[PDB]
Amino acid sequence: TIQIEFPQHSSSLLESLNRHRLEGKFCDVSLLVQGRELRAHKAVLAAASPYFHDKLLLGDAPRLTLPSVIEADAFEGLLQLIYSGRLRLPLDALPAHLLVASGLQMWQVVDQCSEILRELET
Amino acid sequence: TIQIEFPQHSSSLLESLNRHRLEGKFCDVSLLVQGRELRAHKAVLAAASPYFHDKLLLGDAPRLTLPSVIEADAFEGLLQLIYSGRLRLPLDALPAHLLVASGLQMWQVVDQCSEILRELET
Amino acid sequence: TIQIEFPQHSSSLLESLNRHRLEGKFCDVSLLVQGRELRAHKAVLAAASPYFHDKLLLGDAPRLTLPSVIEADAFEGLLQLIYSGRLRLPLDALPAHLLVASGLQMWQVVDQCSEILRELET
Amino acid sequence: TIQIEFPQHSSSLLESLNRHRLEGKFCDVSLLVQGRELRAHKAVLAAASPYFHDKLLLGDAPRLTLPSVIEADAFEGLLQLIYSGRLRLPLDALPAHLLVASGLQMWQVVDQCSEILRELET
Amino acid sequence: TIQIEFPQHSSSLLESLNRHRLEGKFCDVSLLVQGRELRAHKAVLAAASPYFHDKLLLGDAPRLTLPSVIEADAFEGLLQLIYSGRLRLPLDALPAHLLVASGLQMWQVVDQCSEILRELET
Amino acid sequence: TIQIEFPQHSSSLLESLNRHRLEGKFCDVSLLVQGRELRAHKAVLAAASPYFHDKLLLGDAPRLTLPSVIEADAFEGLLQLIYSGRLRLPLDALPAHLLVASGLQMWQVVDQCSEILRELET
Amino acid sequence: TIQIEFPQHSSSLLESLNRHRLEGKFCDVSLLVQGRELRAHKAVLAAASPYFHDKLLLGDAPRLTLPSVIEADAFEGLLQLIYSGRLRLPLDALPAHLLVASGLQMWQVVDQCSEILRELET
Amino acid sequence: TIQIEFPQHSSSLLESLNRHRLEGKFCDVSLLVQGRELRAHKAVLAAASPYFHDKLLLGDAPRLTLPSVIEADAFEGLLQLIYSGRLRLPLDALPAHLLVASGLQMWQVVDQCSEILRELET
Amino acid sequence: TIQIEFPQHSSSLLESLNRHRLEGKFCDVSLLVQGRELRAHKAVLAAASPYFHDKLLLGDAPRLTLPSVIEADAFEGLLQLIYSGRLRLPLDALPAHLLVASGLQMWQVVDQCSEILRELET
Amino acid sequence: TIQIEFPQHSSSLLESLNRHRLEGKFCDVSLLVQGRELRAHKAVLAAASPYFHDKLLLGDAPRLTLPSVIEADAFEGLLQLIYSGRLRLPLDALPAHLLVASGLQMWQVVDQCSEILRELET
Amino acid sequence: TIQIEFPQHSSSLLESLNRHRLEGKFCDVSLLVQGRELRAHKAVLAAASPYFHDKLLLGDAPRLTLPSVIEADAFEGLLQLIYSGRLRLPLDALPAHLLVASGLQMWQVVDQCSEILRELET
Amino acid sequence: TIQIEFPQHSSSLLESLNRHRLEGKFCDVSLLVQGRELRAHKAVLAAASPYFHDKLLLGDAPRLTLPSVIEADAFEGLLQLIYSGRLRLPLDALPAHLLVASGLQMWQVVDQCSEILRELET
Amino acid sequence: TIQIEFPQHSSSLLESLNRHRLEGKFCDVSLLVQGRELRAHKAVLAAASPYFHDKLLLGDAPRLTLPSVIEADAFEGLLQLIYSGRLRLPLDALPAHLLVASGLQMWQVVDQCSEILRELET
Amino acid sequence: TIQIEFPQHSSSLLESLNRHRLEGKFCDVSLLVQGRELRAHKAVLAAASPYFHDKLLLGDAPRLTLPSVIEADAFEGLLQLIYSGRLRLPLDALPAHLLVASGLQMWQVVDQCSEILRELET
């Protein structure tokens, strides 16, 4: 019996996924955030975000309008993180991003961001 | 046709429910937060919190263990707010509560807390 | 310390709960009135009616059949009031409803209905 | 600017994806292979296999019947690899799996399998 | 009404066209395989291979560079088969050729080659 | 050594090509016959007709207008024969079709048609 | 400025050419038609017939064997027409000549012959 | 018996021949005149000029160099006349052209040119 | 070895030949020019004129009738030149003589005559 | 009045004649000398030799066989002189050559040769 | 039948004729040779010498002057031979005499003399 | 000193002379005998007969008519004898011939004929 | 005018002449015939025979010796005839006499003698 | 024996004699008569006249001078008679002639003349 592992398979898959998202390829849902329309694929969002998970499980709408409180720019940063595992932002935007991240129930990211804010205050 | 309105009907009912929860009466769910057990009623929590609502809609467990990141004290303050509409806390504790509130999708409360924090910064 | 109040939180919550009851969501008790089955939530009924309160405290049955003397129409009107705060009925049906209200120990409602009946008599 | 990386994020997401495939949640395509019906999600298949990518891009059918030459068992093993990054199989089944893998255009895997077969030959 | 059929019409057309290719006449696409350039006609390749058909439908490039994993000798033998219906190769090269055929989705040929390999093993 | 032959393979490929011509897919030339525009594939026409063969060999025009003397209906019958090997026509139209065939240098068909006309005379 | 025109220059030149033909002078190509060998000049044939034009442009053979279907006598009549502009033939031989004319792509002549046949029919 | 005449057949044919000469198509002889090389077709020249007839009959050279006394410009004018039946030249160049015409033994043209020169003198 | 030269041998021989011609001795050809009969020797004419060489190689006729366009007097002057190397003529007859000279292809004489005409024009 | 002289005209004509001889062109008499047959032109011989002049005037035979006493080599040298004006020979052969010259009545040549013999004697 | 022959008849005739010539009787031609006048009979001279024969056949002059190169003494010796068949001369004069004989074409004697000269050189 | 004699020189000369007479060449006298005109050479006749010598000395007439008594046939026999040395005649004509011979003073011939006649008489 | 004729004058004169001859009177010539000397008168002989006349005009010799063939007796008989006009001879001597008469040119006598011999033969 | 007579022999001989005398041929004597010189032959005169006979036999002089009394004219007439036998004279001259006849002793003539004179006187 054989076991094969490709450590960078996942990273390549995520890069290609993000690329297609940018290319607008195979996107099946449109997200309206403060008037900004962003296309994405439902399965990845549901698998990545428990909020989106339940959202999809309960409602099969091709378009989802997010709460007005959710900032479009912060949402774009978290979407980039979702499709890259990386987040670059200005310091002053950390709270807003953090806030939205909490709304998406991303507790590992919330933990790290809270740790970073605490480190900054100290 | 006659019209009757009870402005304090809702407040009286909420107070009754709150006191019931306090005494442990008819509580049907137990919430574990960092080792702290807090009893509450599933219907009230689902009706008040979309997060709680979908969670219940998806899982009918008498006991729910919250993410370790959720602090017991902030959660207890938010629960008393849920069952009273009022929140009293120290200034320095405003962030933590806010974090938890965002996880529970209380967008009016999140807005108010963010505005207050911004006012404090100024 | 900050204090936040949302005057319409309770009313919106009661509207949502009423819709759920109609939608049959999370309803945990079935009320049989003269052969007619009407679904409702045990917690709401106990909180609203001291009669139901004690009844549930003593008996945890998913189905409750009320005495045959209780008219179905009065019961649905009172249920609409309980889950909406509103009651619309024909004048001649006021006594029956009143009677049922007394059985539910709604003394504010019983008082107001008696006053209205007295006004009609005068 | 801060940079956060979660090496086990992709693995966890893949696990969740596989679990969903198993439980039939959010599956949007049914694949018929030698009379065997297997549910899966179109986006993951397109992102993982260039063959699937093209197939879906050209045809949005909820059901896809693969060529009869594709074995159901080999296809299910490769699907497990797709959703886990691991493949365990009997030695004698390696060619068939390999064959299907070539049809799925998994060239890294094809390279590794050819190397392993060569090692067996030596 | 009359019906005329020419059984060898198709074969004569395929031989003439194959020779034209060998003569480099009317070839409209150039295939780069491991540094080797091979001229061919887009219509015949698209009509014969679904893989090539799809690639053409998606991209009208006069030059197509094939994946490095595709071996030049197997590809030239398979090109000879496509343009002649005949394939002569050494026994030990059968897997590689087979492999390429799978990438080109020649499933009848893949079946026949797998059967031949199986008989050889016995 | 193995030999594989597919008697119905070339015919099927031709059928696919004809279907494409019908639906307008991959057609690269437009033929003007008495004001009627007809789409077709240059390679098929050159391979099938030596007249059209040299015509294309000498002139790479996307549009070719045939002499006005060429009848549209006769040309459509001959094109159907070219892409199907079958011709259905009224008896009285046999001369015109024959005429066009000579211009297209279809000498087998011309032979058969001359034999048939002679048979008709007898 | 002066303008000189010789209306019978062309006719006299054609006469000289035909004279050379009958004497076999300067003929550079030999045409085999049903076993009959006929000498002729390549340039005149190419200039007069598009078929011959292309044939010569493609193949510079001193001898060209025509298809067996082409009748020798009809071909000699058409060659005489080519070299004189006049054609005298028996009525019953008109079809064959016409046929050959179509093969030689003399479309004005084909038109005239079809008109004459129609006139005979009427 | 029928007789068909196409008065402009010859002129169109001559036009085609001249056009081919211009392009260099089917030209079989190269004429060197005072160091200037001009391609042309042997048959047309022999048929048009008795001098060319004789010269060709006596010598089968692909290249013919004319006497140095023959001016190149007059020769191209006479060649265009040969292939068109028309001659345009400056008045003062009329003698030179005439001279060359005599060498080519075109006595009708010589007669007309002498007559025109005489008319100019008068 | 000795070398003897007779510079006037050729001139004396020419004189003798011309005298013989005048006396009609050994004359073997009769030239008809516009009805005028002139006797001469074929060999001298062929050696002097390339046209005569050609004509004799092509035709052994004791009598040759030249084209009517050739004037008898110009021909007699040119014959005198041929048999003497000297030509005296009136100026106005130079073209006609010149014309005839061109027909006889005496290009040195043509050169000289063209030079004299050009000098006269200047 | 003009007079034209060509000093090398005679020499060029005689070279052309001799070349024709060497080429066997236009020779009209055959001379048999000691079994060797040599072709030549009657007019040239008559003009050059008085003996031959008379011979031809009297007998128009295409073949003349001279008495054997005439040496073939001497005759060939004298004929070369006739057609060139030059004679190269060995000293010891001078008498024989002289003899033949006398038979042909070449009195200038005989005189020169006798004078040369006298110089040799001195 | 009788046959009479007179072998010395001819010799008597010859001697008589020679005597006549000597006395100057019946001589009908006078020959001028280098200023020496010698009388002779035309018939004998024509019968004996081809040269003289032709000369007379063409010119009936009572006096013939020979070329100055012909020596008078050699001619008189040769004339004596002509009228006697015998020649006596000095050795050194043999060439000159030979020469004259050749001019008169007395082949037999000319040859005899060449043999004698050859004998002398040997 | 050498002496050359040619025994058949005289006979050859006489035969040639007789032949020349037959062809009528150089005959200078015409003899009229009984109305028959016969051409001959005066010199031969004068040289052979003394009577002829005399007649010539006395009269230089181109024509001589002999006395009628001389028969033409005998004269022809004697003339052939004169020019040949041979005589063929019928026996009975010997006297007549003899008679003429006597008139011509042929005393040797008369002697021979008389001897032959005497032999006949004996 | 008177005319006198004496028929016998001539005969008497001839008698006197003959007598003088017999007497040797006035004889001026001596004739030697076969050794026999006979005197006679030159004038008579010349006047009677033309041959005599001629010979005498040619030679004034007092003695003439005749050819040996002339018989003395025949000569004397003919001489007596000359001087008498009468001839008596033996028959057998008629030829000899005839012979001499012919040599002497006596043609009247020759005619008569030939007639007499012929009469004898008949 | 034969006898031949020629009656006109004498007359022909005498006419020839007379004619020769006129021509002065063979005349050997000159007669001087009164200054007139007349040539004649001695033999004829001696034979005809006895006077002349005597004159000659006695004197052999080439010239004879007659007596002066003899008239020249009469002598010439008598000489004509001697050579003709005829005499024509005027009547009055008859005596003189007679006288001369007497001197010549012509007694027959004298007799005849006397008879004629007597006839005249009578």
Curated annotation (Swiss-Prot), chains A, B, C, D, E, F, G, H, I, J, K, L, M, N:
Please classify the protein's predominant subcellular localization into one broad category. nucleus
Which N-terminal stretch is annotated as signal sequence?
none
**Which controlled-vocabulary keywords does the entry list?**
DNA-binding, Isopeptide bond, Metal-binding, Nucleus, Repeat, Transcription, Transcription regulation, Ubl conjugation, Zinc, Zinc-finger
Which locations, inside or outside the cell, does it occupy? Nucleus
* Source domain of life: Eukaryota
Tell me which residues make up the BTB domain: 27-91
GO CC term, one of those recorded? nucleus
Q: Name one GO biological process term.
A: regulation of transcription by RNA polymerase II
The Swiss-Prot or TrEMBL record annotates one GO molecular function as: zinc ion binding
Function description: May be involved in transcriptional regulation.
> What name has this protein been given in UniProt?
Zinc finger and BTB domain-containing protein 9
| Entire-sequence positions represented here | 22 to 143 of 473
